[PDB]
Nucleic acid binder design. Structure first.
Lengths: 98, 83, 100, 151, 206, 114, 127
RNA sequence: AAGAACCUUACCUGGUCUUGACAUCCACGGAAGUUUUCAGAGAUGAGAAUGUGCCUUCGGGAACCGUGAGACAGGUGCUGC
RNA sequence: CCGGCCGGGAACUCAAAGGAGACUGCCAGUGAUAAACUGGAGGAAGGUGGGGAUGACGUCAAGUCAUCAUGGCCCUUACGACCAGGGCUACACACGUGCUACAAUGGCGCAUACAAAGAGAAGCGACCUCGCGAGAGCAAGCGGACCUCAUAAAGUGCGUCGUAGUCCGGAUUGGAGUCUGCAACUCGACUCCAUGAAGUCGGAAUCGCUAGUAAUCGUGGAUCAGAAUGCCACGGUGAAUAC
């Protein structure tokens, strides 16, 4: 079995990537589970904005990390070289795991 | 308090100074800047000039001083009184 | 913020890796449970006589641009000032302004 | 406030026997959002009271409550800059809540072995008219009788 | 203290990021400050050569730097040579192998960084400040912008007391988050001190 | 109704009356009653003399009232004539464990006269 | 068959599966009397089943998750109303006059920067 | 200050260096490096072995080390009026 | 082996993407054929639904030249640089902001129910063994909806305490420890045993809060080798009062 686990910061960018891999999957022999929404990670930082005093003045930022799980089952060698083939984008972390 | 499976603490230079002052037989006050070292039973009777950041105060080792550390007999803050 | 301080931090890192590799296998002989008396009393001092920095507890984690010691964030390696400026300029990817 | 006249909150009734009055009483008597402790005190004060009186629980609480009942209040207003206290006819919904507030203020004093035992002393002491909450009611009535020159 | 950074809040709503790569926590500070070194090094060499924004991709453990510049012919150099220079050094100053691509700017007086470059260079070469600000305003409005505001602050004549001046033309709605607002600040270090320029250009709504 | 130095109260429970001794707190009395075998929720009015003399030897197991005040007083005395840091803080009348001397420590330096 | 209702209240979420049967109530593989003990959820889960007096006629298998016990009581009340509403729809017009179908969101406020617990200021002092 | 035991640290005592702890350029020499000893509170001072790597104008080239001369470096020093 | 454990199932809670939905849209009345207001219906929600982000021209020649940058001065065997030790933690006192309390709506002992949000690889560190405990040994699992931190606490049930400075309070101090760290004396945190201070609801004065709010209870994170009663977040219970 091969599972694809891919993370990003943009959900608009991570949607098209998992769409491309599910389409290049089910073109040839991969009855996939599809993109599966694992919960997103929110990293909330809260910095002071003044160079000096005024502790009460702060700005709160956050990173959101989106997760999609494609779990290709019934794998063929065409699935593994068509996963060897494509090089999706920057900002996308893909891990194929046997 | 240090953990018991570490052993007590003494500096290399202070311990070798203590041993050479015992082997040499001489008993003048010697100086250290190492207030963090534990006193030891071979160091009884001799004078240790312990640094308090400004000076080197002479400490006379007693029977009662053995397990303690060297900084407790050199107060680093001088206070007499406000009024 | 005192070029001396940046020089001192980059001084402590380079000694820290080398003597870290040494004192890691020299440190475990002190307090495993059960080695002996003699290697404990030798090993305290042969951990001691190495210079003070080259220990990782004398790092400071200054800002990687301005060298500011206070207000550090480990995720960005910056002080809060340069985090906020580089976030407003859009250089930290995925760092929106949080509003919940 | 300065503008609004908004609709009232609607609480859930008394569980042991369905009343809004006892739910207001357990809400007044409570502390730091501890509803269960307060209703335990209220129930162990009212079932232990109905055997002191002889009637059932609710209407014994009602004529322990209506003996402490402020007909009028005082207020402070301004006409000449003089700023005196003038009496006012109270609405009964705030009259009832001020009655419950005075009963709890009575029960927080007069200390003995419980809060519920203190309440079961207080409401009987009010229901035969010899309490300190009846002293608060007759002091309010006296301060309005002295100020009846303004109406 | 007023007026949150416009690129900052429209990063949430409208604008895209200057940097586009994913990293976990052990790679994050290293990638961040190596990209800071890359931007700082390209800053001089092409700040003689009219750049607006450089953006960093990192695909497949390799850095990709695409420059937006107003004069691409001075950026590429002759026969490509200059940018291969850039390529050859960026794979030194970022580790991972490097490729540099360049877009053309079709609006040389509508990007706030380039307008700020013009105003700060004219301010440091001792033009009057009012002529530079008014010419930037009339030029952007004549090329076609739905609004501009220029903000110049400092001593402004050689002065004992610093002054602040600004000039808007058109509409420039900052509280509207769907507004496409290019915004950049710059500084001109002059003999009397540092003078700040801020330029908001409003190009329309999405 | 009387152990090594003093009288213990009689209407109170065993562990609560046992804490009236200097040197015996809660865990000491728990161990004393566990070694004696008496269940702790009895009173000294309930309990006879054989249990309290088996209690007498079991509280003689511990350093208690008179020689414990002797031990604490002598330990402070040894620190005070030793002349160390904690002894000198015991001598001036200040905190010895590194408390803030700037504002607080009215327990140690006493009620606020001037 | 098997009628279903989802109630949600104050970060708790109750799933109600009701069927025509006896009057007994079951929550998370316990009965109602041994799951809850206090005066809430002995009134609160009863009031929808008492305004339309159906305490005898239907079995109720309930799973709940999240929140505390009063939030769980409000969530099972909101689930019981919707699951009862899947039977007949004159029921909702009669039960709405006392509430019970208003979801009552009322979340916890977020703690604000500079304040202490989302409304409390930290003690202004002039000097 | 989103965190002073040393560090941080800017402060004081005492010991030390002054083209420097951090930069670039010239000239001279040495792989870089590692291990190890003494005296020292340490910074530092003199050693003792081991090491000689890559292109090759191969008396050179990168990188590292010290030496001397400056240009200068360095300043959490003052004025936020 | 009743633990969704397993065949399985895609209904449900849930996880995230995409839509819808709330507009004074409808109804009646008051209102200048108006804008609007009040009420009603339905509706999960009613009138900017709740909360946040969002801070106009300017003011205070406010703060910061010690984050940074920067003009002008000032220094260059020194106001620069390196080190060890000390100090920033002192204490006749005064003030601000908190935490713990003065108890019985409570204290202690036993059993027991229900969360959300996070952090984790020189890291988080199961299970078992060892110690009263802080902890150690052994050491699986995890770059994580998987494993770990991590038992939630108020609550509930049963007992005991009978209003005393007391089984309230838990400061102080003596002793014995554990862990991090080159090193715990100046000057860490914690654990145990002992001790058991003031305090019995607080003068003149003064502050916060309009609803899932105040009040109260616990949990988590950043900084961080170690070091929160602070700061930032998350939930549990949950009012009174608006003439």
């Amino acid at each position: 079995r091969i599972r694809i686990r891919l993370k990003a910061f943009d959900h608009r960018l991570i949607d098209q990537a998992t769409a491309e891999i599910v389409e290049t999957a089910k073109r040839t022999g991969a009855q996939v589970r599809g993109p599966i929404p694992l919960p997103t990670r929110k990293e909330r930082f809260t910095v002071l904005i003044s160079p000096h005093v005024n502790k009460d003045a702060r700005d709160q930022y956050e990173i959101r990390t989106h997760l999609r799980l494609v779990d290709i089952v019934e794998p063929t060698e065409k699935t593994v070289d068509a996963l060897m083939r494509l090089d999706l984008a920057a900002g996308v972390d893909v891990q194929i795991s046997l | 308090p240090r953990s018991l499976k570490k052993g007590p603490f003494i500096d290399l230079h202070l311990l070798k100074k203590v041993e050479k002052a015992v082997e040499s037989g001489d008993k003048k006050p010697l100086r250290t800047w190492s207030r963090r070292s534990t006193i030891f039973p071979n160091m009884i009777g001799l004078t240790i000039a312990v640094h308090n950041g400004r000076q080197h105060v002479p400490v006379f080792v007693t029977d009662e001083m053995v397990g303690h550390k060297l900084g407790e007999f050199a107060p680093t803050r001088t206070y007499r009184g406000h009024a | 913020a005192k070029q001396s301080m940046k020089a001192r931090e980059v001084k402590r890192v380079a000694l820290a890796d080398k003597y870290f590799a040494k004192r890691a296998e020299l440190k475990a002989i002190i307090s495993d449970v059960n080695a002996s008396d003699e290697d404990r009393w030798n090993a305290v001092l042969k951990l001691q006589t190495l210079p003070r920095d080259s220990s990782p507890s004398r790092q400071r984690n200054r800002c990687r641009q301005t060298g500011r010691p206070h207000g550090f964030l480990r995720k960005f390696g910056l002080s809060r000032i340069k985090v906020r400026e580089a976030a407003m300029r859009g250089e930290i990817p995925g760092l929106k302004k949080a509003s919940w | 406030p300065r503008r609004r006249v908004i609709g009232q909150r609607k609480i859930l009734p008394d569980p042991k026997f369905g009343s809004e009055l006892l739910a207001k009483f357990v809400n007044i008597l409570m502390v730091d959002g501890k509803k269960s402790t307060a209703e335990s005190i209220v129930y162990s004060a009212l079932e232990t009271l109905a055997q002191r009186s002889g009637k059932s629980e609710l209407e014994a609480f009602e004529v322990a409550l209506e003996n402490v009942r402020p007909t009028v209040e005082v207020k402070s207003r301004r006409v000449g800059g003089s700023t005196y206290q003038v009496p006012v006819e109270v609405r009964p919904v705030r009259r009832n809540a001020l009655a419950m507030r005075w009963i709890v203020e009575a029960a927080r004093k007069r200390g003995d072995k419980s809060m519920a035992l203190r309440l079961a002393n207080e409401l009987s002491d009010a229901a035969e008219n010899k309490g300190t909450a009846v002293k608060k009611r007759e002091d309010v009535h006296r301060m309005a009788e002295a100020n009846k020159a303004f109406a | 203290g007023q007026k949150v950074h416009p690129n900052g809040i429209r990063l949430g709503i409208v604008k895209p990021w200057n940097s586009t790569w994913f990293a976990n926590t052990k790679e994050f500070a290293d990638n961040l400050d190596s990209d800071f070194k890359v931007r700082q090094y390209l800053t001089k060499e092409l700040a003689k050569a009219s750049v607006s924004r450089i953006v960093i991709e990192r695909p497949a453990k390799s850095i990709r730097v695409t420059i937006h510049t107003a004069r691409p012919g001075i950026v590429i150099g002759k026969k490509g040579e200059d940018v291969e220079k850039l390529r050859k050094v960026v794979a030194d100053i970022a580790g991972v192998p490097a490729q540099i691509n360049i877009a053309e700017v079709r609006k040389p007086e509508l990007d706030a960084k380039l307008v700020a470059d013009s105003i700060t260079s004219q301010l440091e070469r001792r033009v009057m400040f009012r002529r530079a600000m008014k010419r930037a305003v009339q030029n952007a409005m004549r090329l076609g912008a739905k609004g501009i505001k220029v903000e110049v602050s400092g001593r402004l004549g050689g002065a004992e007391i610093a002054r602040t001046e600004w000039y808007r033309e058109g509409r420039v709605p900052l509280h509207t988050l769907r507004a496409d607002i290019d915004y950049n600040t710059s500084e001109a270090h002059t003999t009397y001190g540092v003078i700040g320029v801020k330029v908001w250009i409003f190009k329309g709504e999405i | 109704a009387r152990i090594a130095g003093i009288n213990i109260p009689d209407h109170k429970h065993a562990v609560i009356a046992l804490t009236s001794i200097y040197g015996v707190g809660k865990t000491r009395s728990k161990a004393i009653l566990a070694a004696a075998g008496i269940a702790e929720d009895v009173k000294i009015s309930e309990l006879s003399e054989g249990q309290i003399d088996t209690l007498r030897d079991e509280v003689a197991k511990f350093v208690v009232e008179g020689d414990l005040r002797r031990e604490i007083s002598m330990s402070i005395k040894r620190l005070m004539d030793l002349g160390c840091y904690r002894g000198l803080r015991h001598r001036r009348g200040l905190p010895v464990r590194g408390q803030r001397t700037k504002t607080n420590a009215r327990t140690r330096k006493g009620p606020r006269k001037p | 068959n098997q009628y279903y209702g989802t109630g949600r209240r104050k970060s708790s979420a109750a799933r109600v599966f009701i069927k025509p049967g006896n009057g007994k109530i079951v929550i998370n593989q316990r009965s109602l009397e041994q799951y809850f003990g206090r005066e809430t959820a002995r009134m609160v889960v009863r009031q929808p089943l008492e305004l339309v007096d159906m305490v005898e006629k239907l079995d109720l298998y309930i799973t709940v998750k999240g929140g505390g016990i009063s939030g769980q009581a409000g969530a099972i009340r909101h689930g019981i109303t919707r699951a009862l509403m899947e039977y007949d729809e004159s029921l909702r017009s009669e039960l709405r006059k006392a509430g019970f179908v208003t979801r009552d969101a009322r979340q916890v406020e977020r703690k604000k920067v500079g304040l202490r617990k989302a409304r409390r200021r930290p003690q202004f002092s002039k000097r």
